[PDB]
Amino acid sequence: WYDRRLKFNSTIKVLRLNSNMVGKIWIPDTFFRNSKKADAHWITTPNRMLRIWNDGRVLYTLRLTIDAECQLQLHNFPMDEHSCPLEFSSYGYPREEIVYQWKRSSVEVGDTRSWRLYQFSFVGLRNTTEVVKTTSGDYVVMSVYFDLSRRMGYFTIQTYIPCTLIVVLSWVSFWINKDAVPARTSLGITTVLTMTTLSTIARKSLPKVSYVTAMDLFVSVCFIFVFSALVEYGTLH
Amino acid sequence: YIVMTQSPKSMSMSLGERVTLSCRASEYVGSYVSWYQQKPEQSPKLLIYGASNRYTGVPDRFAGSGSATDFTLTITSVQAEDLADYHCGQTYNYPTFGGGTKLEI
Amino acid sequence: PSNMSLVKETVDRLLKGYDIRLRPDFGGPPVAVGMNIDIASIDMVSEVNMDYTLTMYFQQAWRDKRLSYNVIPLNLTLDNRVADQLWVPDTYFLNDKKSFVHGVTVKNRMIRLHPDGTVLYGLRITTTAACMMDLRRYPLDEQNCTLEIESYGYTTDDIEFYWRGDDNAVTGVTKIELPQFSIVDYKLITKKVVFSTGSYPRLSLSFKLKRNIGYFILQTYMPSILITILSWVSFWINYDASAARVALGITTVLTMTTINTHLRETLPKIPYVKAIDMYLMGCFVFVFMALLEYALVNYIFFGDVNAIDRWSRIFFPVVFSFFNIVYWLYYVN
Amino acid sequence: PSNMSLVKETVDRLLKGYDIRLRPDFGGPPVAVGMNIDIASIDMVSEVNMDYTLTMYFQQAWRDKRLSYNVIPLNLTLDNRVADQLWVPDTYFLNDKKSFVHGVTVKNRMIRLHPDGTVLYGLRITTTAACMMDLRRYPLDEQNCTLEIESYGYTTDDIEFYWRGDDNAVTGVTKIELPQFSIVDYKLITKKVVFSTGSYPRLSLSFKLKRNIGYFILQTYMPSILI
Amino acid sequence: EIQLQQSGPELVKPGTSVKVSCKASGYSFTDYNMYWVKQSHGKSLEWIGYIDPYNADTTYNREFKGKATLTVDKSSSTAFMHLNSLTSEDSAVYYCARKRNNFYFDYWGQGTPLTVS
Amino acid sequence: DNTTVFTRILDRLLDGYDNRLRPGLGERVTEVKTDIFVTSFGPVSDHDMEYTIDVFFRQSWKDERLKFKGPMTVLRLNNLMASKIWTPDTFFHNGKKSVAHNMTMPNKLLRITEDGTLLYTMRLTVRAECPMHLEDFPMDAHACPLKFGSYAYTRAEVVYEWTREPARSVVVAEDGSRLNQYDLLGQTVDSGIVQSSTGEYVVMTTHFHLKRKIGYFVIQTYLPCIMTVILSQVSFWLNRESVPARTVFGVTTVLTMTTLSISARNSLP
Amino acid sequence: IQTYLPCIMTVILSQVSFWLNRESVPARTVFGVTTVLTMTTLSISARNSLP
Amino acid sequence: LLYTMRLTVRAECPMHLEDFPMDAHACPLKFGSYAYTRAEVVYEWTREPAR
Ligand SMILES: *[C@@H]1O[C@H](CO)[C@@H](O[C@@H]2O[C@H](CO)[C@@H](O[C@@H]3O[C@H](CO[C@H]4O[C@H](CO)[C@@H](O)[C@H](O[C@H]5O[C@H](CO)[C@@H](O)[C@H](O)[C@@H]5O)[C@@H]4O)[C@@H](O)[C@H](O[C@H]4O[C@H](CO)[C@@H](O)[C@H](O)[C@@H]4O[C@H]4O[C@H](CO)[C@@H](O)[C@H](O)[C@@H]4O)[C@@H]3O)[C@H](O)[C@H]2NC(C)=O)[C@H](O)[C@H]1NC(C)=O
Ligand SMILES: *[C@@H]1O[C@H](CO)[C@@H](O[C@@H]2O[C@H](CO)[C@@H](O[C@@H]3O[C@H](CO[C@H]4O[C@H](CO)[C@@H](O)[C@H](O)[C@@H]4O)[C@@H](O)[C@H](O[C@H]4O[C@H](CO)[C@@H](O)[C@H](O)[C@@H]4O)[C@@H]3O)[C@H](O)[C@H]2NC(C)=O)[C@H](O)[C@H]1NC(C)=O
Ligand SMILES: *[C@@H]1O[C@H](CO)[C@@H](O[C@@H]2O[C@H](CO)[C@@H](O[C@@H]3O[C@H](CO[C@H]4O[C@H](CO)[C@@H](O)[C@H](O)[C@@H]4O)[C@@H](O)[C@H](O[C@H]4O[C@H](CO)[C@@H](O)[C@H](O)[C@@H]4O)[C@@H]3O)[C@H](O)[C@H]2NC(C)=O)[C@H](O)[C@H]1NC(C)=O
Ligand SMILES: *[C@@H]1O[C@H](CO)[C@@H](O[C@@H]2O[C@H](CO)[C@@H](O[C@@H]3O[C@H](CO[C@H]4O[C@H](CO)[C@@H](O)[C@H](O)[C@@H]4O)[C@@H](O)[C@H](O[C@H]4O[C@H](CO)[C@@H](O)[C@H](O)[C@@H]4O)[C@@H]3O)[C@H](O)[C@H]2NC(C)=O)[C@H](O)[C@H]1NC(C)=O
Ligand SMILES: *[C@@H]1O[C@H](CO)[C@@H](O[C@@H]2O[C@H](CO)[C@@H](O[C@@H]3O[C@H](CO[C@H]4O[C@H](CO)[C@@H](O)[C@H](O)[C@@H]4O)[C@@H](O)[C@H](O[C@H]4O[C@H](CO)[C@@H](O)[C@H](O)[C@@H]4O)[C@@H]3O)[C@H](O)[C@H]2NC(C)=O)[C@H](O)[C@H]1NC(C)=O
Ligand SMILES: *[C@@H]1O[C@H](CO)[C@@H](O[C@@H]2O[C@H](CO)[C@@H](O[C@@H]3O[C@H](CO[C@H]4O[C@H](CO)[C@@H](O)[C@H](O)[C@@H]4O)[C@@H](O)[C@H](O[C@H]4O[C@H](CO)[C@@H](O)[C@H](O)[C@@H]4O)[C@@H]3O)[C@H](O)[C@H]2NC(C)=O)[C@H](O)[C@H]1NC(C)=O
Ligand SMILES: CCCCCCCC/C=C/CCCCCCCC(=O)O[C@@H](COC(=O)CCCCCCCCCCCCCCC)COP(=O)([O-])OCC[N+](C)(C)C
Ligand SMILES: *[C@@H]1O[C@H](CO)[C@@H](O[C@@H]2O[C@H](CO)[C@@H](O[C@@H]3O[C@H](CO)[C@@H](O)[C@H](O)[C@@H]3O)[C@H](O)[C@H]2NC(C)=O)[C@H](O)[C@H]1NC(C)=O
Ligand SMILES: CC(=O)[C@H]1CC[C@H]2[C@@H]3CC[C@H]4C[C@H](O)CC[C@]4(C)[C@H]3CC[C@]12C
Ligand SMILES: *[C@@H]1O[C@H](CO)[C@@H](O)[C@H](O)[C@H]1NC(C)=O
Ligand SMILES: CCCCCCCCCCCC
Ligand SMILES: CCCCCCCCCCCC
Ligand SMILES: CCCCCCCCCCCC
Ligand SMILES: CCCCCCCCCCCC
Ligand SMILES: CCCCCCCCCCCC
Ligand SMILES: CCCCCCCC
Ligand SMILES: CCCCCCCC
Ligand SMILES: CCCCCCCC
Ligand SMILES: CCCCCCCC
Ligand SMILES: CCCCCCCC
Ligand SMILES: CCCCCCCC
Ligand SMILES: CCCCCCCC
Ligand SMILES: CCCCCCCC
């Protein structure tokens, strides 16, 4: 931003400074609206930078770790795709006092290879700028949307493949002789009961949300097959 | 309230012999039991506080002790000036004293 | 630049000779502090810890004749760091167990002086507030979790709380998308609690939360029913199949114990039977009786029998259906 | 209140022109610092994290001529906030992972000046110290967990350590009641560790912990024996 | 030295009231509560009530609730107990004591004999 | 200008005031009268042998340096004046990690009566160590202590005391109880002297008498233990020729009994 | 000793069934299903040690 | 000036768990100035880089 108070004329074009001067000048009170918890970095010293040009430009950057809030909607899981936002605005200064605006270089997303994003893939980013009305005034809000697409490779080996394979164990009951009453029931009860454990541990990976998800749908249908396979022998005998 | 009961209503221990006085509290009183000596036509005189600590200016012969609900005042060698009624009280709650215990020879 | 210079003299004038130690109108009538909340989110209701976490834009307004200015016709919003130089109410939440004000990129705090003297002061607060829950009807339960806003050091003779806007003080409650619950209602109360140190003003923000039974139906009840349903297939098996029916009956009864034990682990160490418990125990009786149904059949034969299988093939589905009807009507209604 | 005014003048003189940046006998012989621990408790002896939590009253005693007074006959116990205005040894525990000084009702510290200049400086510290455990004979094993008290910036030419009272410097070890450990022995050592930056004083307080096997029969051996 | 001097011997007929004083000396009178004790002839000491001299907050034994009213004067370091509706059973010697701590009664009064007949 | 009268009073009190020196230093012992109001008795963590407790820790003492005369007989102040004056350095001997709540502001009050008396209460969440002897678990009761005293000042420097009768000085809020599997039967208090390396100190002890409620363990361990014992006895009523059926009865119950034994110990240390 | 040996003993255990007489169907069937279910737990339990 | 400090740095080490558990990683620890460019602050190893 520009600060006419901080303008100086000399041979020096910019004053490049450390975190020491940050607390001495006016800094905007930017906060992140959906941050559950965030913190700056302080080792070895505060990870802040400050640069001042002749005309009055102030560049102020700092390193932040933001535990933002992304409201996932896992109706279809683990194929869900999300657009996780990151909103920020001035906490106190209304639209008549602090106006934000994206620079030309909106977001310089770094090399995505080293990211800890295992479940998802960073599809792309999108920015906006809109005025949210609140009880304390009208505030300009700027939000960055990150588009994240789930990968189901782990869940297949973790959940579906065990769920698929156990269902096959029910089918081999049919090839087993009907006369072997303990064998058929042994396979049937063992097959259905372990299906219950797989559903719970598979359901455990999800949070406590009151709606059936796609993963829940698969295990339930697999539950029908194993249950029907046991019931098939019950009527067979 | 908490009632303090002194088991020996009277004591006839001869002079110069160890004499023990007992004081029983119906319920817990911690260590807030104090012993007072009241010679005839005199106000009470503090001797032991805290159920073990001796008030300043008291002869060292007096030595109280006791856990909750069981408190005793032992005089190792009663002398000619220790003959009087003894009162034990508790201040763990609203103060209630016990029946005085008199000494004789 | 006249306003920049003029505003500087005004703000400098106010803070000069300002005593943070004395409240507004010290030694006089109580200062009326209006409060206004905007719930940002209710992160998680925890039965294990008997608390919920709530993020809010806690705002409170009051009058201070010392901070009254009239030279400039506008409302001055200042750096949050000015709050450390002004008297503010010592408001505290009697329930909070672990709470903080967010501090990135700066302390999430607001100050706005108005010409009349009104001070608008806002904080962004995450509070983990204690909420003891009566889980007797759990999971068909309805909790009433509160937030007890109160002044610590100032009695009713020194301070006074009110909801700025009688029922428009609290906002955002409708949009809160709590996964486990549904916020049925919220009430705003004002009281005066008396301690041995004096009488203090109290504001209470209640939330009547209702359980979303849908999550538990798929997770807890449905396995119990199917485990109970498959218990009855033992009755259609031949009587001379001890290895099979016993294996089935033993397998089913043990599974009910594991489900009941597994379910109860997630909850606190609560010393009474909940609605879920009275169902799992109810289903345990049926499956165990089915195991004893065969043991009765086996003893009568080795130690007629087909009739016991037939009647048990009709009674067990029926008497379990009534158990559901009586159970659900008692609890759901 | 006459004596209070007298004490105020004395305590005011000591901190007047007192350079907190310079140790006692700066530019002179090393200052000898005496330590004595009172083990309040040992908890969270965890092999998953390879650490144990130690609560103690950590006292340090050293002579500072600048803080010598003679007018007052009694030893002055001052408010703990005075410690921020006094030079204190920069001792740290090398194997400490996470530590704090207890904070309620106030900072759990003590400053006690003695007329000759001695400074008794106590803290109540809860330190999670690293203890690398050899589980080869677990659970029938004896572990040797230590605490490595050392000066950070001051070498042996600027500071010295000694157990104040020698073998009677550490107390409370007998009273400590660990659930699954018996504290068979404890030892006190005085070393001199050499780094690239110089040689520094070192006090090592080692406890030999012996594991109680009674718990593991109930849950580990007997279930496997019965099966 | 501390000394708690009291009114002195009294004689009174049943039905009428009486007041007894306890004059403090030697210590800050408002620092410590003042307790009142009754002792009938050859009987255990009985606590009547105590008054906090600073704010004159009183607490009474349930038996003496209403029978006795405790009042204090900051100016003159004195404590007063007022008894009304006197009967034969109220004839005894009344003591005043200061509670130095929550452990003991430090200094007791001389003892004020009372007679109702 | 109306407040300027009171501002000049506070300036006078702190003028030439040394908050490093206790009242009556070198002249008298500092009597601190203290009481506790337990707003809630937090949960008991038998795994860590500790309990949580939220209190209004009140403590009062006389400071002759803070006498004043003015229109008001009590100066009802905020936390800022607490740091400006001397206050006792109380601490909890068995405290593990306590919290001095400061949301929205430091939860403290400071009242200076015109005679110099101070009332200084503060809201705390003390997490204290309660050594438990679990020989009769789960049918066991404990007296969890809450000891406190001065950290630096010996008995000759500051002495603690209960502001009311010791029975009446620890008060528990009627609706304040966060215990799940315990009942707060009551509390008892005491005072004593403790020796240490630094000298004799006064310790104010409070024992909260708890009693576990076995309702959970009845329906978590005993009932499963009782029923698996009943299951094993169903085998006695099956014909002796059903070897697989009676064998699965034995192994299943034995394995079930094994996991219950392993599962049961997981709650406690 | 946490994953490979339990996997190697399970597969060796499952091959014990080849020496059991073919006429013992329940004995060999419980040999089969119990080893497969054992394998499933090993697979799931192996992943939890990693992200 | 010699300015030393004791730190417990929790650095990021991206791992390729393709050969897990027979895997080896080269965990990095990169550091430098936050505010000063290469034209203002330069970093160097006090001894040979190896030592
Ligand atoms: C209730 O009590 C709690 C304590 O339990 C108080 O919390 C403390 O508040 C103080 C004051 O705000 C904090 O001190 C500041 O700390 C800054 C760095 O802190 C980092 O390290 C500490 C550990 O030492 C961590 O605890 C911090 O993380 C926690 O706090 C942050 C928010 O700060 C949260 O986001 C986290 O989640 C954690 O909860 C941090 O990681 C420190 O830089 C700062 O000192 C600068 O500012 C002061 C202001 O005057 C200057 O005097 C000083 O010289 C420093 O200024 C230099 O650096 C700045 C940096 O830009 C430059 O701008 C300047 O120009 C100059 O160069 C200060 O010391 C303390 O950390 C915090 N937490 C504690 C003690 O655990 C609450 O505030 C209190 N009140 C309420 C309402 O809750
Ligand atoms: C500095 O800040 C103050 C306060 O924030 C601003 O003053 C506000 O200005 C707005 C703009 O006009 C006012 O808006 C309307 O004012 C009406 C007047 O009401 C007065 O009468 C009573 C007093 O007993 C109160 O209602 C009120 O405090 C006023 O004193 C209100 O009646 C209006 O109410 C409703 O209007 C519409 C109806 O649809 C709704 O949208 C509103 O939300 C509201 O429900 C409305 O409020 C406002 O009242 C002023 N408030 C005050 C306290 O003065 C200054 O303008 C500002 N200065 C700047 C920006 O320079
Ligand atoms: C969650 O659970 C809590 C339980 O703690 C409920 O809290 C109570 O809710 C009820 C219903 O709203 C409240 O009842 C109210 O009582 C007031 C009287 O007490 C106050 O009186 C004065 C104020 O006048 C205070 O200064 C004083 O300190 C007392 O606190 C009434 O004034 C209220 O208004 C109604 O009064 C009568 C009926 O009594 C009507 O005729 C009036 O017209 C008016 O409608 C009201 O009655 C109660 O105070 C709450 N607090 C408690 C019990 O501690 C929550 O309501 C509940 N919330 C949800 C969402 O479930
Ligand atoms: C200000 O602080 C000082 C320092 O503590 C106080 O002075 C010390 O008070 C302690 C009280 O604990 C005294 O300790 C006793 O010292 C006796 C003599 O020790 C001499 O020799 C040692 C040898 O190292 C010197 O360090 C010491 O200075 C003395 O010159 C010992 O004999 C005592 O131990 C004995 O205790 C009992 C009873 O005697 C026996 O049964 C034991 O077996 C054992 O023999 C004890 O250690 C000490 O005398 C004082 N001086 C010191 C430590 O130098 C001041 O009193 C204090 N000011 C006040 C309170 O106003
Ligand atoms: C690492 O460990 C070190 C241990 O040394 C900690 O450093 C100490 O931290 C404390 C807490 O911040 C510091 O205490 C501060 O002292 C300042 C100076 O006090 C003197 O000067 C003032 C006037 O300026 C006099 O009034 C006073 O009597 C002293 O003579 C105070 O100004 C500070 O006040 C701050 O806190 C109070 C709390 O009530 C606020 O009201 C104030 O507004 C202000 O915010 C503060 O009290 C201490 O000086 C530090 N050094 C030492 C040697 O103790 C580190 O905090 C710790 N952590 C880190 C990250 O380093
Ligand atoms: C946990 O594990 C640690 C190991 O890291 C143990 O700590 C080591 O303990 C040993 C033995 O106590 C220390 O070894 C030496 O102990 C000597 C004690 O004196 C005896 O030995 C000398 C010389 O052999 C005899 O003259 C004397 O009569 C005694 O029999 C110290 O004096 C040693 O220091 C001297 O020697 C070294 C080496 O030559 C010199 O460098 C020194 O400058 C000094 O002159 C030496 O300390 C050993 O130091 C301890 N620390 C280590 C190895 O780091 C713990 O004991 C163990 N826990 C328990 C409870 O035992
Ligand atoms: C596998 C699934 C099973 C389900 C099947 C369904 C059927 C099972 C039905 C289960 C529901 C009934 C259980 C509910 C438990 C809560 C009530 C309670 O605990 O009672 C009391 C227990 O306290 C006492 O009074 C002591 C009595 C202990 C009795 C131990 C059980 C009987 C043992 C004999 C059996 C062995 C002999 C058999 C030999 C053949 C109340 O105590 P509290 O509430 O905890 O709190 C402490 C006291 N307080 C309240 C004063 C504070
Ligand atoms: C992040 O936000 C910024 C700000 O909106 C986006 O950059 C801005 O994009 C608009 C629309 O393209 C630019 O205006 C347009 O400029 C072009 C080229 O001159 C012109 O042909 C159009 O008629 C229109 O005027 C705007 O200039 C540009 N911002 C700046 C500073 O130049 C940016 O695209 C956003 N990032 C995304 C969507 O990833
Ligand atoms: C006669 C008969 O048919 C037999 C078949 C099964 C038997 C029950 C098994 C479980 C037993 C547990 C305990 O041993 C007490 C007796 C107990 C209830 C038995 C009652 C008699 C039964 C019904
Ligand atoms: C600064 O100096 C330049 C030339 O040196 C001049 O053009 C400019 O006006 C000056 N700016 C001021 C004095 O603000
Ligand atoms: C563990 C899962 C048991 C089977 C759930 C049956 C309920 C129906 C689920 C599918 C609805 C679309
Ligand atoms: C105290 C509550 C007792 C719970 C009893 C559960 C079993 C009742 C249902 C039985 C259905 C046959
Ligand atoms: C021991 C449990 C037996 C349950 C029998 C229920 C079915 C009706 C009995 C009919 C007997 C002819
Ligand atoms: C409010 C949701 C209640 C749904 C109950 C469904 C379970 C009924 C099972 C009946 C099986 C015989
Ligand atoms: C815990 C007290 C309420 C008991 C509710 C009984 C109704 C549920 C069904 C029980 C089967 C008859
Ligand atoms: C009624 C549940 C299914 C039992 C098997 C029925 C076969 C005809
Ligand atoms: C929206 C509620 C859905 C509940 C799950 C379906 C029944 C198992
Ligand atoms: C709220 C109702 C959820 C769906 C119930 C399913 C009944 C089998
Ligand atoms: C307290 C009622 C218990 C009834 C359970 C049914 C018989 C096992
Ligand atoms: C519980 C069953 C009892 C009846 C069995 C038949 C008579 C021996
Ligand atoms: C699902 C229960 C079926 C009941 C069938 C009864 C007739 C044999
Ligand atoms: C409190 C009684 C619990 C039920 C005992 C179970 C007997 C089979
Ligand atoms: C180094 C481990 C070798 C053991 C393999 C197991 C062979 C059955």
GROMACS .gro file of N, CA and C in nm, chain F residues 27-67:
model
  123
 1046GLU      N    1   0.902  -0.674   6.034
 1046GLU     CA    2   0.829  -0.625   6.150
 1046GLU      C    3   0.719  -0.720   6.196
 1047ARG      N    4   0.654  -0.790   6.104
 1047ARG     CA    5   0.534  -0.866   6.136
 1047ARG      C    6   0.516  -0.974   6.031
 1048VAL      N    7   0.448  -1.081   6.070
 1048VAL     CA    8   0.409  -1.184   5.975
 1048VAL      C    9   0.291  -1.134   5.894
 1049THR      N   10   0.285  -1.175   5.768
 1049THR     CA   11   0.176  -1.136   5.678
 1049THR      C   12   0.067  -1.243   5.685
 1050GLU      N   13  -0.044  -1.209   5.749
 1050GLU     CA   14  -0.158  -1.300   5.758
 1050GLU      C   15  -0.239  -1.289   5.630
 1051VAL      N   16  -0.254  -1.401   5.559
 1051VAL     CA   17  -0.333  -1.409   5.437
 1051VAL      C   18  -0.454  -1.496   5.468
 1052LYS      N   19  -0.572  -1.435   5.468
 1052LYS     CA   20  -0.697  -1.509   5.482
 1052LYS      C   21  -0.745  -1.550   5.344
 1053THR      N   22  -0.769  -1.680   5.326
 1053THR     CA   23  -0.802  -1.735   5.196
 1053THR      C   24  -0.925  -1.824   5.205
 1054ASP      N   25  -1.006  -1.821   5.100
 1054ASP     CA   26  -1.117  -1.913   5.084
 1054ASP      C   27  -1.130  -1.947   4.936
 1055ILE      N   28  -1.198  -2.058   4.909
 1055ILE     CA   29  -1.214  -2.111   4.774
 1055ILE      C   30  -1.363  -2.127   4.748
 1056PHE      N   31  -1.407  -2.081   4.631
 1056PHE     CA   32  -1.540  -2.109   4.580
 1056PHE      C   33  -1.524  -2.193   4.454
 1057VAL      N   34  -1.563  -2.320   4.462
 1057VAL     CA   35  -1.544  -2.414   4.352
 1057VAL      C   36  -1.664  -2.400   4.259
 1058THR      N   37  -1.643  -2.331   4.147
 1058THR     CA   38  -1.751  -2.315   4.050
 1058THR      C   39  -1.783  -2.445   3.978
 1059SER      N   40  -1.689  -2.539   3.974
 1059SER     CA   41  -1.714  -2.671   3.918
 1059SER      C   42  -1.598  -2.761   3.954
 1060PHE      N   43  -1.629  -2.884   3.994
 1060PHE     CA   44  -1.528  -2.984   4.027
 1060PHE      C   45  -1.506  -3.068   3.902
 1061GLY      N   46  -1.397  -3.040   3.832
 1061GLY     CA   47  -1.371  -3.098   3.702
 1061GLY      C   48  -1.364  -3.249   3.704
 1062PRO      N   49  -1.349  -3.309   3.587
 1062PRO     CA   50  -1.343  -3.455   3.579
 1062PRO      C   51  -1.216  -3.509   3.643
 1063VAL      N   52  -1.225  -3.633   3.691
 1063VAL     CA   53  -1.113  -3.704   3.751
 1063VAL      C   54  -1.053  -3.796   3.646
 1064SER      N   55  -0.922  -3.786   3.627
 1064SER     CA   56  -0.849  -3.868   3.531
 1064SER      C   57  -0.768  -3.970   3.612
 1065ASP      N   58  -0.831  -4.083   3.642
 1065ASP     CA   59  -0.762  -4.189   3.715
 1065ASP      C   60  -0.644  -4.245   3.637
 1066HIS      N   61  -0.644  -4.231   3.505
 1066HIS     CA   62  -0.530  -4.278   3.426
 1066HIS      C   63  -0.404  -4.199   3.460
 1067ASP      N   64  -0.417  -4.068   3.476
 1067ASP     CA   65  -0.305  -3.982   3.512
 1067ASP      C   66  -0.298  -3.952   3.661
 1068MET      N   67  -0.389  -4.006   3.741
 1068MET     CA   68  -0.396  -3.979   3.885
 1068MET      C   69  -0.402  -3.829   3.911
 1069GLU      N   70  -0.505  -3.766   3.855
 1069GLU     CA   71  -0.521  -3.622   3.865
 1069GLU      C   72  -0.668  -3.587   3.853
 1070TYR      N   73  -0.701  -3.465   3.893
 1070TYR     CA   74  -0.835  -3.411   3.877
 1070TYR      C   75  -0.825  -3.264   3.843
 1071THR      N   76  -0.929  -3.213   3.779
 1071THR     CA   77  -0.940  -3.073   3.743
 1071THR      C   78  -1.042  -3.006   3.835
 1072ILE      N   79  -1.019  -2.878   3.863
 1072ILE     CA   80  -1.107  -2.802   3.951
 1072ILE      C   81  -1.100  -2.655   3.909
 1073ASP      N   82  -1.216  -2.593   3.892
 1073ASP     CA   83  -1.227  -2.451   3.861
 1073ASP      C   84  -1.276  -2.379   3.985
 1074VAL      N   85  -1.204  -2.274   4.025
 1074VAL     CA   86  -1.228  -2.207   4.152
 1074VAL      C   87  -1.218  -2.056   4.134
 1075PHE      N   88  -1.285  -1.984   4.224
 1075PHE     CA   89  -1.257  -1.844   4.252
 1075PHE      C   90  -1.166  -1.843   4.375
 1076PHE      N   91  -1.036  -1.836   4.352
 1076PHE     CA   92  -0.940  -1.843   4.462
 1076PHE      C   93  -0.929  -1.705   4.525
 1077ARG      N   94  -1.000  -1.686   4.636
 1077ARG     CA   95  -0.999  -1.559   4.707
 1077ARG      C   96  -0.892  -1.561   4.815
 1078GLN      N   97  -0.820  -1.450   4.828
 1078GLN     CA   98  -0.725  -1.434   4.937
 1078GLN      C   99  -0.718  -1.286   4.973
 1079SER      N  100  -0.717  -1.259   5.103
 1079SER     CA  101  -0.722  -1.123   5.155
 1079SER      C  102  -0.613  -1.104   5.260
 1080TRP      N  103  -0.557  -0.983   5.264
 1080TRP     CA  104  -0.453  -0.950   5.359
 1080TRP      C  105  -0.454  -0.800   5.383
 1081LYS      N  106  -0.390  -0.759   5.492
 1081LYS     CA  107  -0.383  -0.619   5.532
 1081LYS      C  108  -0.252  -0.560   5.483
 1082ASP      N  109  -0.260  -0.446   5.415
 1082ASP     CA  110  -0.143  -0.372   5.367
 1082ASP      C  111  -0.162  -0.227   5.411
 1083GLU      N  112  -0.088  -0.186   5.514
 1083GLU     CA  113  -0.105  -0.052   5.568
 1083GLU      C  114  -0.061   0.056   5.470
 1084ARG      N  115   0.019   0.021   5.370
 1084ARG     CA  116   0.062   0.118   5.271
 1084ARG      C  117  -0.053   0.165   5.182
 1085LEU      N  118  -0.165   0.093   5.180
 1085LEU     CA  119  -0.276   0.121   5.091
 1085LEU      C  120  -0.397   0.178   5.165
 1086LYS      N  121  -0.375   0.247   5.276
 1086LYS     CA  122  -0.483   0.319   5.342
 1086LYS      C  123  -0.513   0.448   5.267
   0.00000   0.00000   0.00000
